[PDB]
Design a protein around this ligand. Structure first.
Ligand SMILES: *C(=N)[C@H](C[C@@H]1CCNC1=O)NC(=O)[C@@H]1[C@@H]2[C@H](CN1C(=O)[C@@H](NC(=O)C(F)(F)F)C(C)(C)C)C2(C)C
Ligand SMILES: *C(=N)[C@H](C[C@@H]1CCNC1=O)NC(=O)[C@@H]1[C@@H]2[C@H](CN1C(=O)[C@@H](NC(=O)C(F)(F)F)C(C)(C)C)C2(C)C
Lengths: 302, 305
């Protein structure tokens, strides 16, 4: 029992982290097989951070302009290509620590772990969610770029995020491993701001189910709601509209607790009206929205 | 910027986790050099659990009663012995993935990373504090025993915790890797309860510094308190007393933020006496106490391993 913000074990990702240097810019790279993936802005100097022409900057580079370092070893770069906003460096060594992996593009609400890295070395692992506004509330300093977000399913690592930038609210934007940004952001130092963020409603409901499974019922009520009445109320607390897809996905937690999804929505409605009045749920006086239905089943099995 | 509950990278520890089976009990072992460490209660049948005689169970078992698997590989056990509440299995093979390590015993308030494992398989990593009542607020199911807690200092893993049990309140108790329990607990199936917990004051202050470093400043006031005045209000709300040591440890954060410790004490005193007035700090409605001063400096500086 118990309920923790919990990250995947970082070892399979630690074995893939390299340092990538181009001129005087150093950030992190993900060495999978014989490719190093990293943010393409590694090829930027300070001036052209505003309107970089990445194709023009990249055509001016030779393979030998890229310092890739894995611990002591300099890897030999034998190819460079750009895919969207990631630079792919072909190297002369397959990484022998390469885990089973896939690249996956996630949707807002989805959770994942971040291995925060500096100079190709891991600082820490934490658990994130893709916010509705396509930002992540990360912990990233100078040189963090190329740090990745991942899930692990059995022994397969699904890379879903590569870190590129921090927005003015102290929140973070990045790409999938195909170099496509999450949300409307660009890898330019032009004026960009996160849209108004909303609460991941399906995730709050999952967490309320976890509270029940861990034996807390104080916030339940004898009410139900229509999906539509629920959304009309939730949206006034800047909650994401709950969809039928979201109701379906709460099915298993509903079955394990015996609390109908729309009954739990009724509870959430009242929680939004009343707050906690000094009470907590699972050690929080906020409603937690960075645990998916899948995270709750994984931690609350027995 | 940003501030997250951050665990140490778990890779050096994942290379050491194995599955130990004795009879029908499977749990996790820590394989370092040619020894596999695990809770001694692995040898217990349902009967034994209730009033175990560990020494006696142990001596009546051949090495072959201990099934140790690192992935698809069976390790050969060539010896077994008890040290307090940990079983040590001598294996015929040094773990080629053994990191630089030591066994360390941590103090209440100190934080560490737990690598939750099942069937020798790392499932999750989370950052924990040793509560003042020597429990941890963990997340552990059946088969999680032998899951370990650690810190990393450079490339040295300091193992500080092995998971043994869950108390009725849904909190967790365990030993250092020398099998000494944290807290007044025993590895028997018997009614035990966590004593009353207190808040790790020095950690809350470090976390308020983390807030200030990330621009979360609303709870700052102009006032300064004293240790004595603060500690009189602190004890009353079941907050650990703050020592001159605690104050000295915050000096780097005090100097970085321009917020003196006894000012942050005044801010924390007001928060205890006033609550947060529908406000959050670093996305929490509650005062967080599972970040140490060293945790805040390391995360806010970008220290790597
Ligand atoms: C990678 N090494 C950093 C990660 C940043 C640094 C501070 N915290 C982080 O997460 N990435 C960058 O420096 C990117 C990079 C140029 C500028 N940049 C930014 O993150 C900047 N932000 C923006 O330009 C904004 F607001 F538009 F997102 C900065 C002001 C330095 C935080 C490029 C090419 C975007
Ligand atoms: C090891 N794999 C489990 C881990 C437990 C199982 C549920 N969550 C956990 O953290 N450890 C045990 O099953 C230990 C073990 C016998 C019984 N036990 C307990 O954790 C039990 N607790 C207690 O008896 C109590 F309350 F005193 F702490 C149990 C009721 C099964 C949770 C021994 C030798 C203590």
């Amino acid at each position: 029992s118990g309920f923790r913000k919990m990250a995947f074990p970082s070892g399979k990702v630690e074995g893939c982290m390299v340092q990538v240097t181009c001129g005087t810019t150093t950030l992190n790279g993900l060495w999978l097989d014989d490719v190093v993936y990293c943010p393409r802005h590694v090829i930027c100097t300070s001036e052209d951070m505003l309107n970089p022409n990445y194709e023009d900057l990249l055509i001016r580079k030779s393979n030998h302009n890229f310092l890739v370092q894995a611990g002591n070893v300099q890897l030999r770069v034998i190819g460079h290509s750009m895919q969207n906003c990631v630079l792919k460096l072909k190297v002369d060594t397959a990484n022998p620590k390469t885990p089973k992996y896939k690249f996956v593009r996630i949707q807002p609400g989805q959770t994942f772990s971040v291995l925060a890295c500096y100079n190709g070395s891991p600082s820490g692992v934490y658990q994130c969610a893709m916010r509705p506004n396509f930002t992540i509330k990360g912990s990233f300093l100078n040189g963090s770029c190329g740090s990745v977000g991942f899930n692990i399913d059995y022994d397969c690592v699904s890379f879903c995020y590569m870190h590129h930038m921090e927005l003015p609210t102290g929140v973070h934007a990045g790409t999938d491993l195909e170099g496509n940004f999450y949300g409307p952001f660009v890898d330019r130092q032009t004026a960009q701001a996160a849209g108004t963020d909303t609460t991941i409603t399906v995730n709050v409901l999952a967490w309320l189910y976890a509270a029940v499974i861990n034996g807390d019922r104080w916030f339940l009520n004898r009410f139900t709601t229509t999906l539509n009445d629920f959304n009309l109320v939730a949206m006034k607390y800047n909650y994401e509209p709950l969809t039928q897809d979201h109701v379906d996905i709460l099915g298993p937690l509903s079955a394990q607790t015996g609390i109908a999804v729309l009954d739990m929505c009724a509870s959430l409605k009242e929680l939004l009206q009343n707050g906690m009045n000094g009470r907590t749920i699972l050690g929080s006086a906020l409603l937690e929205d960075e645990f998916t239905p899948f995270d709750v089943v994984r931690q609350c099995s027995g």
